Amino acid sequence: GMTEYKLVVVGACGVGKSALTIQLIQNHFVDEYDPTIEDSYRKQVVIDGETSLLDILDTAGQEEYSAMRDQYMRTGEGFLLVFAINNTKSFEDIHHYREQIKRVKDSEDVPMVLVGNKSDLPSRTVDTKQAQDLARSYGIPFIETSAKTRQGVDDAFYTLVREIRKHK
Ligand SMILES: *CCC(=O)N1CCN2Cc3ccc(-c4c(C)ccc5n[nH]cc45)c(Cl)c3OC[C@@H]2C1
Ligand SMILES: Nc1nc2c(ncn2[C@@H]2O[C@H](COP(=O)(O)OP(=O)(O)O)[C@@H](O)[C@H]2O)c(=O)[nH]1
Ligand SMILES: [Mg+2]
Ligand SMILES: [Mg+2]
């Protein structure tokens, strides 16, 4: 029957990964969601008229590598690389996330979308230009989002699914 998409949401602590996922799945904003909890969450959506089952891994836990997380990441079909526009370190970290995703997937041209979250905030330290240029270098789309307002949330996950469909 319906197609399942194994999505993974990655990025530095506090960028909005959980707030983004909960918005997509549950349609509300959760301030200060428990930072320890890593889980996968499912939702059926219609995208370009095709019914699809999104299985979304909201990454958390500790800053450590394991063989087990290598294997969970390897099973992911596409990844949202999330930073916050008010957190330059989070944007610098994107490169290291991509490097490790590529390591665990044999350097495949992996479906990835760059996400600049917290776009509602006036305290920007990452210029949109720098994000656009980074996504251009990686050959991936870049979406601006606010989990708080819901701006761009559907576009981020739908674009990733469209990237996975385009890929094979
Ligand atoms: C505030 C907590 C939070 O949301 N975090 C912090 C911990 N963690 C970082 C982290 C580190 C490594 C990896 C990773 C990746 C990207 C690929 C392969 C791999 N094998 N072992 C670990 C690996 C990941 Cl997925 C994460 O997830 C983000 C969270 C964010
Ligand atoms: N203003 C604003 N705050 C956000 C947004 N997304 C998440 N937050 C807040 O940023 C903090 C971290 O979000 P969280 O979802 O826990 O980040 P995660 O660590 O990446 O899972 C929390 O206080 C959230 O309410 C956003 O788009 N705008
Ligand atoms: Mg979280
Ligand atoms: Mg441990």
From Swiss-Prot:
SUPFAM superfamilies: P-loop containing nucleoside triphosphate hydrolases (SSF52540). The modification N-acetylthreonine is found at residue 3. The modification N6-acetyllysine is found at residue 105. Acetylation at Lys-105 prevents interaction with guanine nucleotide exchange factors (GEFs). Lysine-depalmitoylation by SIRT2 promotes its localization to endomembranes in endocytic pathways. Disulfide bonds: none annotated. InterPro entries: P-loop_NTPase (IPR027417), Small_GTP-bd (IPR005225), Small_GTPase (IPR001806), Small_GTPase_Ras-type (IPR020849). Changing residue 23 to E: In CFC2; exhibits an increase in intrinsic and guanine nucleotide exchange factor catalyzed nucleotide exchange in combination with an impaired GTPase-activating protein-stimulated GTP hydrolysis but functional in interaction with effectors. It is linked to Leukemia, acute myelogenous: A subtype of acute leukemia, a cancer of the white blood cells. AML is a malignant disease of bone marrow characterized by maturational arrest of hematopoietic precursors at an early stage of development. Clonal expansion of myeloid blasts occurs in bone marrow, blood, and other tissue. Myelogenous leukemias develop from changes in cells that normally produce neutrophils, basophils, eosinophils and monocytes. This is GTPase KRas. It comes from Homo sapiens.
